Scaffold this active site. Structure first.
Site, mmCIF file in Angstrom:
data_model
loop_
_atom_site.group_PDB
_atom_site.id
_atom_site.type_symbol
_atom_site.label_atom_id
_atom_site.label_comp_id
_atom_site.label_asym_id
_atom_site.label_seq_id
_atom_site.Cartn_x
_atom_site.Cartn_y
_atom_site.Cartn_z
ATOM 1 N N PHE A 194 0.791 -1.226 0.000
ATOM 2 C CA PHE A 194 0.000 0.000 0.000
ATOM 3 C C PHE A 194 0.828 1.284 0.000
ATOM 4 O O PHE A 194 0.289 2.370 -0.221
ATOM 5 C CB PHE A 194 -0.982 -0.001 1.175
ATOM 6 C CG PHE A 194 -2.105 -0.988 1.023
ATOM 7 C CD1 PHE A 194 -1.945 -2.307 1.418
ATOM 8 C CD2 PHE A 194 -3.319 -0.599 0.480
ATOM 9 C CE1 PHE A 194 -2.975 -3.218 1.275
ATOM 10 C CE2 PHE A 194 -4.354 -1.505 0.338
ATOM 11 C CZ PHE A 194 -4.182 -2.816 0.736
ATOM 12 N N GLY A 195 2.129 1.168 0.244
ATOM 13 C CA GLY A 195 2.991 2.338 0.226
ATOM 14 C C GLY A 195 4.393 2.137 0.770
ATOM 15 O O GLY A 195 4.795 1.017 1.091
ATOM 16 N N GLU A 196 5.137 3.236 0.876
ATOM 17 C CA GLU A 196 6.521 3.200 1.344
ATOM 18 C C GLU A 196 6.723 4.049 2.600
ATOM 19 O O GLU A 196 5.856 4.838 2.973
ATOM 20 C CB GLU A 196 7.467 3.693 0.246
ATOM 21 C CG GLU A 196 7.392 2.916 -1.057
ATOM 22 C CD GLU A 196 8.185 3.577 -2.171
ATOM 23 O OE1 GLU A 196 8.651 4.719 -1.974
ATOM 24 O OE2 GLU A 196 8.339 2.955 -3.243
ATOM 25 N N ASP A 302 -4.489 -4.971 13.951
ATOM 26 C CA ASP A 302 -3.226 -5.589 13.551
ATOM 27 C C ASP A 302 -2.108 -5.282 14.542
ATOM 28 O O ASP A 302 -1.386 -4.297 14.392
ATOM 29 C CB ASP A 302 -2.823 -5.146 12.142
ATOM 30 C CG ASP A 302 -1.713 -6.002 11.558
ATOM 31 O OD1 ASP A 302 -1.664 -7.210 11.877
ATOM 32 O OD2 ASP A 302 -0.889 -5.472 10.783
#
Ligand SMILES: Nc1ncnc2c1c(-c1cnc3[nH]ccc3c1)nn2C1CCCC1
Ligand SMILES: [Ca+2]
Ligand SMILES: [Cl-]
Length: 433
Positions: A194-196, A302
């Site tokens: 989903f991203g960095e 999570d």
């Protein structure tokens, strides 16, 4: 007419902010958050200042040995930090007696190791303060000076005040949404689906961590929502959400935890020479954080050592929380089979996390694939106890791993137990006559 005094040396990083040193006094013009418009008295310049770097003159916090808003467990954590020896002491606001004080001293008895003892401080009449009704004092300063000169009924005499650190500078004023051009993402730290995540710099100075998001499934104006929501949930055990870049793709700017994730830290070299009490201290910090989340009725969905970050001073915080309203070995069967996922499933997750911490970052259910795990969980299987794990800590994990969701403890109880894990309830405050 309001005069304050600076507690630490400070440097200007913005344009309209002042610079001073430890001891310089200043007049206050405006109160509006963490930044106060103030006029210096040595430079006579009018700039903005961090409100948590100054304090009103001779009003307790001015003294080296006073520490405001510090809990008993926090005072214990600080007095055992590097830089403190025997007799290293501090005076703080009482946590169980609002409007009163408590003294915390560092001691050593051979049958336990280094310890921190806490004495209550009584105050009325009003002739002053006392710890023992035999010896009374007018001010807290003279009281300190007495016990500093010989331990009059204490397990140790007073040496030096606690090695206080300079506070983290507060975020720039008005700088919630910021121009992207203010960023220099100078190192990629992590990448995933989903991203960095990058180590960046916000305007020449001030290090920062940025999470860049490749759009699509995550909408546009559906992000200023979760941003403005999580910005209202400030906590010392949650990672601080600083700024957010308007234009797409959206950038999330937070504080930079100097030692990466907890999982990386445990698997690392330094985080393997870390003894068991420090691991318990970590899980107590995480529990404290999950307890604040619990008080606000939110869910994390999570929870694992990969989503827990460590500062340079071994402080644990919680990262991307609530990003599941925006990978199953940590998930309770109620959330696997039926997709429940509540604060109780997070208690289960905390149980597996507790398993990670104690096993120095080891994979939960080793040798088992996810199917081999789920099939065995219905079989009533729970993870065995490691050879270096106390039976009482193991019992805590087991309590977190109950079949019934609501028979599991609360993060409030878990934190409390973990906080005083090595201390009997009666031993919290040593009472001297
Ligand atoms: N804040 C940080 N500071 C230092 N290192 C960080 C991080 C983060 C991180 C983790 N969760 C985040 N949520 C929003 C921004 C954000 C950043 N991720 N990382 C790396 C990601 C895996 C190891 C370290
Ligand atoms: Ca006692
Ligand atoms: Cl003036």
């Amino acid at each position: 007419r309001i005069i304050v005094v600076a507690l630490y040396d400070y440097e200007a990083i913005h344009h309209e902010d002042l610079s001073f040193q430890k001891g310089d006094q200043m007049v206050v013009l405006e109160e509006s958050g963490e930044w106060w418009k103030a006029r210096s008295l040595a430079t006579r310049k009018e700039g903005y200042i961090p409100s948590n770097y100054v304090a009103r003159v001779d009003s307790l916090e001015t003294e080296e040995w006073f520490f405001k808003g510090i809990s008993r467990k926090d005072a214990e954590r600080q007095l055992l930090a590097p830089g403190n020896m025997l007799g290293s002491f501090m005076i703080r606001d009482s946590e169980t007696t609002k409007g009163s004080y408590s003294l915390s001293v560092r001691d050593y008895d051979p049958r336990q190791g280094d310890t921190v003892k806490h004495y209550k401080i009584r105050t009325l009449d009003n002739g002053g303060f006392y710890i023992s009704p035999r010896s009374t004092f007018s001010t807290l300063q003279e009281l300190v000076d007495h016990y500093k000169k010989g331990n009059d009924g204490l397990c140790q005499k007073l040496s030096v005040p606690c090695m206080s650190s300079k506070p983290q500078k507060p975020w720039e004023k008005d700088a919630w949404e910021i121009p992207r051009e203010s960023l220099k993402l100078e190192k990629k730290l992590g990448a995933g689906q989903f991203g960095e995540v990058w180590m960046a710099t916000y305007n020449k100075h001030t290090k920062v961590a940025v999470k860049t998001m490749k759009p699509g499934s995550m909408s546009v104006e559906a992000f200023l929502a979760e941003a403005n929501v999580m910005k209202t949930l400030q906590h010392d055990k949650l990672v601080k959400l600083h700024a957010v870049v308007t234009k797409e793709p959206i950038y999330i700017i937070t504080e930079f935890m100097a030692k990466g994730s907890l999982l990386d830290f445990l698997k690392s070299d330094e985080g393997s020479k870390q003894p068991l009490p420090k691991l318990i201290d970590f899980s107590a910090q995480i529990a404290e954080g999950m307890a604040f989340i619990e008080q606000r009725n939110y869910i994390h969905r999570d929870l694992r050592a990969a989503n827990i970050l460590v500062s340079a001073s071994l402080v644990c915080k919680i990262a991307d929380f609530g990003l599941a309203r925006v990978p199953i070995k940590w998930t309770a069967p109620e959330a696997i089979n039926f997709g429940s996922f509540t604060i109780k499933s997070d208690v289960w997750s905390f149980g597996i996390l507790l398993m990670e911490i104690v096993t120095y970052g080891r994979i939960p259910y080793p040798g088992m694939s996810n199917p081999e795990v789920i099939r065995a969980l219905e079989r009533g299987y729970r993870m065995p106890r490691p050879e270096n794990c106390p039976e009482e800590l193991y019992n805590i994990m087991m309590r977190c791993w109950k079949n019934r969701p609501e028979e599991r403890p609360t993060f409030e109880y878990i934190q409390s137990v973990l906080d005083d894990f090595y201390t009997a309830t009666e031993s919290q405050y040593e009472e001297i006559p």
